[PDB]
Amino acid sequence: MIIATAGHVDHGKTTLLQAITGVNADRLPEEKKRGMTIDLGYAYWPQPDGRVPGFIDVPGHEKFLSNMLAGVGGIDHALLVVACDDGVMAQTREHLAILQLTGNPMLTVALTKADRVDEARVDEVERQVKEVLREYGFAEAKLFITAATEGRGMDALREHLLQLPEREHASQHSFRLAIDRAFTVKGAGLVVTGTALSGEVKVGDSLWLTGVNKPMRVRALHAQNQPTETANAGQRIALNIAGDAEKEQINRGDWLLADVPPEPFTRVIVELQTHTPLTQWQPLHIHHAASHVTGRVSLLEDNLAELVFDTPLWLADNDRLVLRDISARNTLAGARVVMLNPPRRGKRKPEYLQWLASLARAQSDADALSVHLERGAVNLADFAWARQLNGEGMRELLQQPGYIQAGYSLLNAPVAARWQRKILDTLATYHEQHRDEPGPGRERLRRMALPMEDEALVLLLIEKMRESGDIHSHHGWLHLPDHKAGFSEEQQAIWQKAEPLFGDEPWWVRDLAKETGTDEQAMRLTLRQAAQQGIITAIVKDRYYRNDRIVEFANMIRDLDQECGSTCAADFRDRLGVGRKLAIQILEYFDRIGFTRRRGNDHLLRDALLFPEK
Amino acid sequence: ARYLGPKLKLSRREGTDLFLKSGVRAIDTKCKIEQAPGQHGARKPRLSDYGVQLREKQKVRRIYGVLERQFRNYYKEAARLKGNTGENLLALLEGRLDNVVYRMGFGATRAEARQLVSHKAIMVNGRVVNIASYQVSPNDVVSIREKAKKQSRVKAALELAEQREKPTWLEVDAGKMEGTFKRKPERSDLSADINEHLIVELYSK
RNA sequence: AAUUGAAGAGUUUGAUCAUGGCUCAGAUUGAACGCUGGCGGCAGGCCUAACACAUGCAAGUCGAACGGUAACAGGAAGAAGCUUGCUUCUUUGCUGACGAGUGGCGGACGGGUGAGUAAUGUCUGGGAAACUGCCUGAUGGAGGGGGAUAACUACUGGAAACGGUAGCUAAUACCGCAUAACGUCGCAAGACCAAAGAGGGGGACCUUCGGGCCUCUUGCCAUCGGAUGUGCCCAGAUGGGAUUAGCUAGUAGGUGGGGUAACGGCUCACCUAGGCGACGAUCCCUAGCUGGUCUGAGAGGAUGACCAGCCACACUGGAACUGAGACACGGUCCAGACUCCUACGGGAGGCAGCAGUGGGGAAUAUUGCACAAUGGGCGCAAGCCUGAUGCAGCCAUGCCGCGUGUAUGAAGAAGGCCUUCGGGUUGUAAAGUACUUUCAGCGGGGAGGAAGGGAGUAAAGUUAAUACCUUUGCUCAUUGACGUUACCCGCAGAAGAAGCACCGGCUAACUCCGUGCCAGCAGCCGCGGUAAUACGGAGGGUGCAAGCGUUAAUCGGAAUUACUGGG
RNA sequence: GGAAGAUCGUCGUCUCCGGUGAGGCGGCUGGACUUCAAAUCCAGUUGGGGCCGCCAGCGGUCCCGGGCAGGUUCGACUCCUGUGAUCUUCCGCCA
């Protein structure tokens, strides 16, 4: 039952804490020397019951506010002390505004200096507080009027203290710890104390220290002046950790958490709640639990704002923080983290619709997931970071029907079908761009379609298209079923005059090009397509023959196994008169095909139909 | 450990048929291995002595898929052994288990032999083995695990084995694709192209 | 069978041949940092501040040595509660046991460090003038008395620390007596020196009915041994400096005393005046040394990390006793310095052990588990103790292994680069196709390290004894921190898995662009002056590889201190 | 963290400045500029921002700029209060 004490300075908050717990909050000699609570001090109230409520006493000073902001992380309950002598103080009202903006589930008002005042002032200040609660939108509040030096209200306070909930936490949350005070004790290393936002930890656990960027083994821990082998979220946690990290790099407001964060982002969007409206692009202090930053706010639709940070910070969705004026004086407005990586150009027409879909439409990660899928591919790393998912949390998207998950980004199945149709239309445009090309290869379609998108998602989507049968491929060439390799007329026009020419004796590429007045590269490609059709065969690069002479080449090869029983060149001269160069290029062409095979002295005929009956 | 990358481009850096891939062929030859090894291979290199001897060392070390340091171990032991270092070195080097799996022919390549031995399939003298560098003793039997039998790969390699001509110094019954090694080959029965002493003074630095 | 083994290059000139250094290629590390990093095995892991240390642990053990009952579990009489044999509480060492106390043994082993240390040490070869507790062998004795004291009781000091006062008592504690030579001294004659029992069992017989008595175990004392270790001495061998050539009066011998377990100026008395020294005395600087490690063809060089041997040290300085063994890491006393406590009068403490913290620095780890096993201390043994040890944790720090997929796959894609723009490079690489699950993961099955030890029981031996006890068998159950071991079975999918440096010549590996003696690179010779094969980038290539690169360090190359091997 | 201190232009240094911003000094980029330099000036350090067309890879809008905000004050870089940031020194980091 952690109860943090707050209120205007020197209104008995320490006297109350010594009354209940008797702990001495002072630690540094200066605060001892100066008698004020210059900086945060802790009290705890161990009991036989086995719960230890946590007490955090804080300065009520604005220059010292940065430390109170260190202490406001993880509060279960807040108690604002108010002396009856002046009633509520302005600092107290400031703290009340800061709690309303932070969304603290409940707070108690405790009235002090009651003995010194007459009871009429007691009832008057009681009325004034109960009016102020309505001013701040406070719901339940239990006002306790007490002289803490006298112990007057203690028994009435006790029931309330037992009433206060301890926050439960789901077992499925990524461990997150907010570092507060790093001080070595001479024994066993660093022991850094800080509030645990989520998760459990043990001595064998490795953690990841942000801002130092190093893993750290846990040496030991104390739950709340209560040493234990394990620690759960919802309490201040002394945490003794090992590892290469050292105090010079350590900073208050550093996070200790299970897995390495993606690097901090300056830009962020936040929901605004404010007592009065903020103005666009103005400097201000960002104050987050244990984090000081300076940034300029911008206005989007209405109570929506864009924070620009001069100081990069680790963050997560739905983390409330308070935004004060840059020079101080006044607490003006609250903030909540919504999108963790906003793009530039937020009033731009396509984007504002997307933002309204991202924000108003979805509190839940599944609904935001679908929104982002309509926006485009959703990388699991960024999604899990924004939602602070653990692996058990990661598997929930696997649990969902209708989400296509490749090695990273999800893409919605109908949306993936949309991208399919886009690939088809793009492929149509490419088939138009070259009517004579049978078609692009797979990876080439990937680049022609969605180069930005993940290779696994896109190629898997291509595989789904192949299952649909929209296009059929062979030898890695992807083409529509309709193709008969008839081609585009630009090629055929050459192939008509080229046909008789090819017939009576086929010729080399450069000679062909010379004969038909066509460009060498153009000529090569038109004839290679002609050869894919099965019209001409190159026995060697740039040397093209007809088909009717190929079958004749097979009839001359027919007599070799039967008449000789070996395959040798000699028959080049001893059969038709065809030169050795010709015969050898023929042989290597048929060897690569598998029409013949070469081993030592002779060529085999293992798999063709060239063989005669006898 | 393994190289993992295109093999015959490194094979064509020397312009030799390193038997890195087999199937229907030994080297494709038609892949322009000699004319354009690289971006500047169009101009004929001449290459100084350290380049030819080291590049040859590269060749042989690649055909056996060994690394430099334990190759140097083979060098230091080869010198430690009595008699000629080059001859007995090459002989024991052919004693390597992957090479023997290759010459017995149930394996498309010595690298495929790495695959099949890595997959626990091999069983020598009733014992499973992994390392391809093991040098089998003379007149020692070796077998493949009976469950490895029936895979299409083994026979499809056997037609190539028969075409390759198979070793004479090893006797493979191939009735159960289980052969017996006999003895390490003599220098005269093999290669007649590589010159081992180049490598031995290459490490005499 | 006990070897098999030695490379050069560049750079002085206009050119040559010499001499001569300078630099590099090699190998290596207890290495560090940079970039990269998938796994497994085997090693290593404060070389700085011998700088200071929180906290805990690391040396305890024996009731089968003694009086005891602090605590527990039985038993005992008794309480008579009541759920009338369930429980209630008293008293009860009388049993199992053991707090604390006396006493025995260990604590002088093992661990850590290399500060001091150039000889008092170490190595090797020796030697005589010594010792060796408990182990083991022989030889024999072992009887009979006395007086205190801790524990305890009553009182009391002081903040605490730690005592003090008075009284009671046991002991295998202490002191006597008796007795003892094959022991010691004595030429000899003679003289002298020892103790303690406990435990188990037991027939007959005593029985103050506790026990005596019989038997066995083991304990005590004496003498000669063994072996082991230790002490002592000698001979050399073991860094640099002569811009250190003089040095010493207890130093060199004598006689006598003292002293050592033992020789001896070890020490004293007195006498003598010697003694050491270019074979380097003396003095100074550096330093633990060796077996060895790295390097080398070799001879040698450097070095002495891990491991093993020897010495030395325990915050510093010293001291000496107890003890077989110490001038004693975790004993004592004094003083000092540093920190802590204190009622301020006075006390307390020492990680160069296991871990750990800070400091130093470029840098080196669990504030870990088990005594399961090996080893060690005590004990009859079980067991008790153990940070020795066994592992585990951590780290690419090193050595080693494997994987990040083999086959086929050209219409040789796109893109990039390069052009003569005609064409080639990346490249069968990818894609495709047949495959493949190694390892990893999951879920199961599942060796061995583990020998023994305990109980029971049989036989044999001993004994008056079928008792106790001892040995050898056999049955039973049992000893795992590692361990979710190794190993295998499957299940599934290439699924979880390649980077680093270099590309002018030495030295294997090139083109364009950007920049223009600028920005900058650089081990050396060098480069860049608007067309840089050397900067920066791109692509491509080369070399290593789960590692790759610079710096640091040693040998090699350097036959460049040259015995082999120089002028 | 706290106390106190210095600094935070518009390219840097300084004089500053309460009358509306300016100037001394400097480095560099060039032009006018020589054989190179040197010098002189010129031109310039062009700054940012919400938003726009955008990816236009940029360019405009209006607005602003002595770190930023606030107030004087009639008017502020100018006075001052703050605010942080960097920077100097010191106090303690006690589960």
Ligand SMILES: Nc1nc2c(ncn2[C@@H]2O[C@H](COP(=O)(O)OP(=O)(O)NP(=O)(O)O)[C@@H](O)[C@H]2O)c(=O)[nH]1
């Ligand atoms: N009469 C009376 N005076 C009280 C009572 N409690 C506190 N006070 C006054 O409050 C003073 C102590 O205030 P303290 O508790 O130190 O103030 P704080 O609010 O905790 N300081 P900070 O706000 O910085 O944390 C005392 O000196 C006393 O005069 C009370 O019960 N009765």
Ligand SMILES: [Mg+2]
């Ligand atoms: Mg206070």
